[PDB]
Amino acid sequence: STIEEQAKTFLDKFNHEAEDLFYQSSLASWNYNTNITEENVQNMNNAGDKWSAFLKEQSTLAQMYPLQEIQNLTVKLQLQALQQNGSSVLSEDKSKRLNTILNTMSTIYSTGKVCNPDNPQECLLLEPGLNEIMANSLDYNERLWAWESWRSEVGKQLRPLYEEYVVLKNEMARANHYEDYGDYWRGDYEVNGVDGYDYSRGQLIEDVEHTFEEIKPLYEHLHAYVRAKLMNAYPSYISPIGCLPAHLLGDMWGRFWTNLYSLTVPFGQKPNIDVTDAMVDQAWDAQRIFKEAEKFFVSVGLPNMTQGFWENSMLTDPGNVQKAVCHPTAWDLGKGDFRILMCTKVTMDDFLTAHHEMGHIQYDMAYAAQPFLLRNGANEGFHEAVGEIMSLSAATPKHLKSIGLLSPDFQEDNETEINFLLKQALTIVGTLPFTYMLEKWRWMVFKGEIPKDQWMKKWWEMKREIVGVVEPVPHDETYCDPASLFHVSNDYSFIRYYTRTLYQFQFQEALCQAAKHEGPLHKCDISNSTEAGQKLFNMLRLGKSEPWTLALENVVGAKNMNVRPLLNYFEPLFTWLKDQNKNSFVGWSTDWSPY
Amino acid sequence: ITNLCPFDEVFNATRFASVYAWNRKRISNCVADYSVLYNLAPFFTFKCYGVSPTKLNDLCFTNVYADSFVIRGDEVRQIAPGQTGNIADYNYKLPDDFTGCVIAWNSNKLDSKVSGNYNYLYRLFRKSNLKPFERDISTEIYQAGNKPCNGVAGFNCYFPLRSYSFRPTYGVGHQPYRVVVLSFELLHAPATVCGPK
Amino acid sequence: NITNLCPFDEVFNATRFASVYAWNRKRISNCVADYSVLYNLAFTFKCYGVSPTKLNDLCFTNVYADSFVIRGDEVRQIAPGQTGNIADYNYKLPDDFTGCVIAWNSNKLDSKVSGNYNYLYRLFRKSNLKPFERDISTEIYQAGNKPCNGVAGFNCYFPLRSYSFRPTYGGHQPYRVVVLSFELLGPK
Ligand SMILES: *[C@@H]1O[C@H](CO)[C@@H](O[C@@H]2O[C@H](CO)[C@@H](O)[C@H](O)[C@H]2NC(C)=O)[C@H](O)[C@H]1NC(C)=O
Ligand SMILES: *[C@@H]1O[C@H](CO)[C@@H](O[C@@H]2O[C@H](CO)[C@@H](O)[C@H](O)[C@H]2NC(C)=O)[C@H](O)[C@H]1NC(C)=O
Ligand SMILES: *[C@@H]1O[C@H](CO)[C@@H](O)[C@H](O)[C@H]1NC(C)=O
Ligand SMILES: *[C@@H]1O[C@H](CO)[C@@H](O)[C@H](O)[C@H]1NC(C)=O
Ligand SMILES: *[C@@H]1O[C@H](CO)[C@@H](O)[C@H](O)[C@H]1NC(C)=O
Ligand SMILES: [Cl-]
Ligand SMILES: [Zn+2]
């Protein structure tokens, strides 16, 4: 008996036991998330602990196959998915130190509060306070206080934790035959071993940086229109040559500019399109919304939903008699069980979120005939993009007038399309330089190009160079501004949002070319397009068995990440941005400071 | 005419056998009315091989065997002449010249518990493939590698039988299915197994 | 007195043959039937009424050439005075049939590695077929005492099912069969 046959036998045992144990852990997590009681906390904390212990035990036995004498690619991919070590290659006093500083950062980010500087008893924490303050207020000093006190009370408490966390994760990465911790997060795209479709870990740097020079002609015009419209709101605070302050971007960290639509509206005479008043007149509920999403999904060739999705899922909140977490999450319990946990109100945003998560369910339903260690996306960017390309097509007025919510005798001019495209660009385009800047900062801190006494001075100049955001207050090297984000202080990868944004528009352009649509890309309805569904199912069926470089060419034709479908979507908005920027200054001067 | 074949004992049983220890009951010296088994729903797995279901009550055969076991819904297609898998290779093999019908139905309302029905097992690891109509009930430890372990499990030594869970929320294809396989033989014998006049 | 050759090439070396449930009827006449060319194929040449040696000796009438595709275990099935699945539901020869049943194994045209599902056979039929009767019906058979109104299920089966015809069986290999049925009881 060879080594690969023993590996296939061990994987056949693991795919029998791990599916049952993961179903137990997912059922305990579903019973916790559907009923927040005390009896479901201990069941989840026992089932997840048993599943983690079983995964650690099977990862311990998987290292007896030395990965070099197996010629099959599927067994090698499952064994690389199974032979992960993590913090097990370090000493115990460091492996528990990393956990007790990550939990310390999590408890500081969750529990840390900011008190008002007029009443020492009145204090405002994160979720009901400054998030709603910096998204509704329009004065300079209140947003300046809400930014600076949050960066002072919470930010500088995490810098001695981050200084140890970086070195501990670098030691953990170099113990697992890497060079830095940024290369470990870049190892998700490592397809080293496939003929004609290889992808190195270091190729992602000059594949992200190469697609960024085509965004900044659109991003510079977008930022030009944003601060040209924001100079009227804040007089004598924003210069027409310099950058934008961080506390005037609509949010806390400057990620999404979607809260700037009330001041940077193109045409304030007419309101935006919404069908909430059309849904509350025809007595629409959550079941009708999900059945209309199902009728949208079966018209391309995707199969019907299972009976368990209509029997065991929670599609409506039962009120204050059974406490449940009202956070929308698509569940993949395995063994043919697919559920959706969502407190669905009668809202157009809920109508788009239902399609966005039925896309995740139909993604989970496609590779059910795969092994258990391949039951995920090919990388961390396809899963949210499959959900996003359904919400792009569900928000079109063609689908809204085809399902019955819109009467056909309405006028659709360009003054609605520009207002829709700028609202789309404030969420999509405005977050990509911030994402690329943060990921390049983390990659240069992890690999050792930024020393410990040059963190904030390089951060606040790379913000000026990439994003165009200048600090309102001079910050020394005691603050830690990346530590004020949820994805950085809780050890989460952030390159997924840059890649998913390009993959979503690549999928949309591919399905629009397959759907034979002659108009613009933002009015492309792929509802009644059957020939595109068989091409999208050729990518949905794969999962993690075959490379993502081959999974792209099955649907979009290209082999790498392309940015031209992203620019083709906002091209009528790009011509309007060229038309509107006739007297403004396209660009920003990095030497200007508001203080 | 009041000598009926025991179809109610191999269909309406209290519990069915496993796929590695499948029961075999000989049916003889009675008339076989195949219009009695229409009471169950859902039912549409009636792939009769060799003979036609319309001419089923026209020919008289010798001693008829009946095999009953429990598998999942996605492995019902493996019970056919010329199929490859884990049930049709290590648990229950049908011949290529099989003359009979395969009858299965959904059993999610009877063979499911909250939470766990571990009484139904299936053989997963075996050295050689099974012969047609062979019943292996051994519990020998499978030798996955080139090293003896002397009856105990561990590295490269696994138990051949694996346990089903059978929870009632297991979608459509992972639901438990009670399968009854009828085999009609044509040996040189006094033929008595055929329907009413 | 040889005037023109009979069209034996279009009924033997055709592009495609029909199935056993939808067998065609090709009538040939007004020519000289030479059977010395017919030994070109490289297995079943049993002739009834007229011996195959003296086949080029008598002057006949309108010959009906029927082309169809069956398997290897059904060459013994199609015979005058037989019953079964093909001789009762698809194609039945008369009891006083005079002619030859020319069958030969091919294993190159009607056997695909993925499956050739273009040839159908009928297994479900109310009554037995008459001699020289063709039925290309497609209605769903009613097996029980319950009208389905067109739907399928137990006691309502589709009568037309397809063969597999893999080039790996022993028997089950496809046979391209052309049967001639002359009705009079010739070169120089
Ligand atoms: C086997 O079980 C079936 C259902 O599990 C039963 O069928 C019943 O048969 C009686 C006698 O004709 C009918 O009156 C009932 O209406 C049937 N029930 C159903 C649900 O179909 C019965 O227990 C067994 N079958 C027979 C023929 O005895
Ligand atoms: C009809 O039958 C076969 C087609 O399968 C062909 O026979 C060929 O005939 C030519 C003419 O003499 C020979 O050179 C070839 O060797 C024959 N091929 C085989 C495989 O036997 C042809 O199309 C027709 N036969 C005749 C005799 O015309
Ligand atoms: C590799 O594994 C897959 C899945 O088990 C199998 O289908 C394939 O035949 C294997 N390849 C080889 C060369 O054994
Ligand atoms: C599948 O979904 C469509 C869309 O609502 C519906 O009309 C149809 O009845 C569904 N089929 C099944 C079998 O549920
Ligand atoms: C497809 O076209 C039909 C007919 O115009 C329409 O009723 C339906 O809403 C469209 N969309 C889908 C998803 O079926
Ligand atoms: Cl910041
Ligand atoms: Zn989502």
Residue numbers in the entry:
A (entry chain D): 19 to 613
B (entry chain A): 329 to 525
C (entry chain B): 328 to 369, 372 to 499, 501 to 515, 523 to 525
What do the paper's sentences say?
An unusual RBD-RBD interaction in the ACE2-spike complex supports the open conformation and further reinforces ACE2 binding to the spike trimer. The ACE2 bound structure reveals that the Omicron spike trimer contains an unusual RBD-RBD interaction and extra interactions in the ACE2-RBD interface, both of which contribute to the higher affinity of ACE2 to the Omicron spike trimer. Consistent with involvement of spike dynamics, ACE2 binds to the Omicron spike trimer with 6-9 fold higher avidity than to the WT spike trimer, but binds to the Omicron RBD monomer with 2- fold higher affinity than to WT RBD. We suggest that in addition to destabilization of RBDs in the closed conformation, the RBD-RBD interactions that stabilize one RBD in the open up conformation within the spike trimer, may act together with the compensating mutations in the ACE2 binding site to contribute to the higher affinity of Omicron and this likely plays a role in its higher infectivity.
